[PDB]
Design an enzyme around this catalytic site. Structure first.
Site, short mmCIF file in Angstrom:
data_model
loop_
_atom_site.label_atom_id
_atom_site.label_comp_id
_atom_site.label_asym_id
_atom_site.label_seq_id
_atom_site.Cartn_x
_atom_site.Cartn_y
_atom_site.Cartn_z
N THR A 29 0.83 -1.21 0.00
CA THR A 29 0.00 0.00 0.00
C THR A 29 0.88 1.30 0.00
OG1 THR A 29 -1.69 1.24 1.31
CG2 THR A 29 -0.61 -0.60 2.42
N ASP A 139 16.13 -3.98 -10.33
CA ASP A 139 14.87 -3.31 -10.69
C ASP A 139 15.07 -1.78 -10.84
OD1 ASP A 139 11.95 -3.10 -11.14
OD2 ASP A 139 11.50 -3.23 -8.99
#
Ligand SMILES: COc1cc(N2CCC(N(C)C)CC2)c(-c2cnn(C)c2)cc1Nc1ncc(Cl)c(Nc2ccccc2P(C)(C)=O)n1
Length: 315
Positions: A29, A139
């Site tokens: 979240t 990443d």
């Protein structure tokens, strides 16, 4: 290796107050908030990140906490501490301007050459520090660079970061969801990750910034990217890019990983360009653009084209 004597700070739920949700996505979240440490007249703007309690969702977050509590560089995101509630919470510094991808898109007509070239130097400094700490990000993308101020960015998302031993020079992954449009060819075909495969990802990151937030290989399915790169095909030259900036991107995409530049070389190269930014980036409006002597290669001598400051000359 050397002992990792870093300190993991554990925080009380009472010490910090949530305020708003920042994101939803894959991860968990992420909330905006304030952290008032115990008995200190200090209020710290923070970002609280969680995941739904599953034994795998708590293991992955703690490996990220491990990595983040080890790093300490002005261009790398640091962990303030963890909160051990039902669902484990990662507490990091608030980057009030969000991710760099969203910011280049939202401010497409206010970003000048000086800003773009400086984010390129900053991302290379953060990535060089990770190479020093033997970490492979795996990443690196523009969505994983956060904006503290428009003049100061930091690398985030250590949820894939891998540490290497002194007698280890490659990371061999087994499986998992991987962003292919940012991956090096050796990573797509052999699941090999080195600091040199991060340099590939750095190339796409620079490309995303230079195209003001365009999608790499837009409208081309993932299965097809491995082939495109095998032919010799790379991402296009962005309109604002001189051949000097583009040649740097193209080098980050060599098939031979050892041919690609190193992050310490990327710092030097973008620093020289940042001393005369309008010679390397052709942006319509540059001279009159804002985002709320001393900074040019003029000073007092001969051809100061190759002048680098000691802070940019890392070894
Ligand atoms: C006020 O501060 C923020 C505001 C944000 N806006 C941007 C403008 C938006 N309007 C105009 C549409 C509203 C949301 C955002 C943001 C938005 N999208 N994203 C991806 C991040 C982020 C921050 N700051 C912030 N500071 C620290 C961290 Cl750790 C963090 N993380 C984060 C938050 C959301 C999603 C994903 C992450 P990740 C997985 C990259 O760590 N995020």
């Amino acid at each position: 290796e050397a002992p990792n004597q870093a300190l993991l700070r554990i925080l009380k739920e009472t010490e910090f107050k949530k305020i708003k949700v920042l994101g939803s996505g894959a991860f968990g979240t992420v909330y905006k908030g304030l952290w008032i440490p115990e008995g200190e007249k200090v209020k710290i703007p923070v970002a609280i990140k969680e995941l739904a309690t599953s034994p795998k969702a708590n293991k992955e977050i703690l490996d990220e906490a491990y990595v983040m509590a080890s790093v300490d560089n002005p261009h790398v995101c640091r962990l303030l501490g963890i909160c051990l509630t039902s669902t484990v919470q990662l507490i990091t510094q608030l980057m009030p301007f969000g991710c760099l991808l969203d910011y280049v898109r939202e401010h497409k007509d206010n970003i000048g050459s000086q800003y773009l070239l400086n984010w390129c130097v900053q991302i290379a400094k953060g990535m060089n520090y990770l190479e020093d700490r033997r970490l492979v990000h795996r990443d690196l993308a523009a969505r994983n660079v956060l904006v503290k101020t428009p003049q100061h960015v930091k690398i985030t998302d250590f949820g894939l970061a891998k540490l290497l031993g002194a007698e280890e020079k490659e990371y061999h992954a087994e499986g998992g969801k991987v962003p292919i449009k940012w991956m090096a060819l050796e990573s797509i075909l052999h699941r090999i990750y080195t600091h040199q495969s991060d340099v590939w990802s750095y190339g796409v990151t620079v490309w995303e910034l230079m195209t003001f937030g365009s999608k790499p290989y837009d409208g081309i399915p993932a299965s097809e990217i491995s082939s495109i790169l095998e032919k010799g095909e790379r991402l296009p030259q962005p309109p604002i890019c001189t051949i000097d900036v583009y040649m740097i991107m193209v080098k980050c995409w060599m098939i031979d990983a050892d041919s690609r530049p190193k992050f310490r070389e990327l710092i030097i190269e973008f620093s020289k360009m940042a001393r005369d930014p309008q010679r390397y980036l052709v942006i319509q409006g540059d001279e009159r653009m804002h985002l709320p002597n001393f900074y040019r290669a003029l000073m007092d001598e001969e051809d100061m084209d190759d002048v680098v400051d000691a802070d940019e000359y890392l070894i």
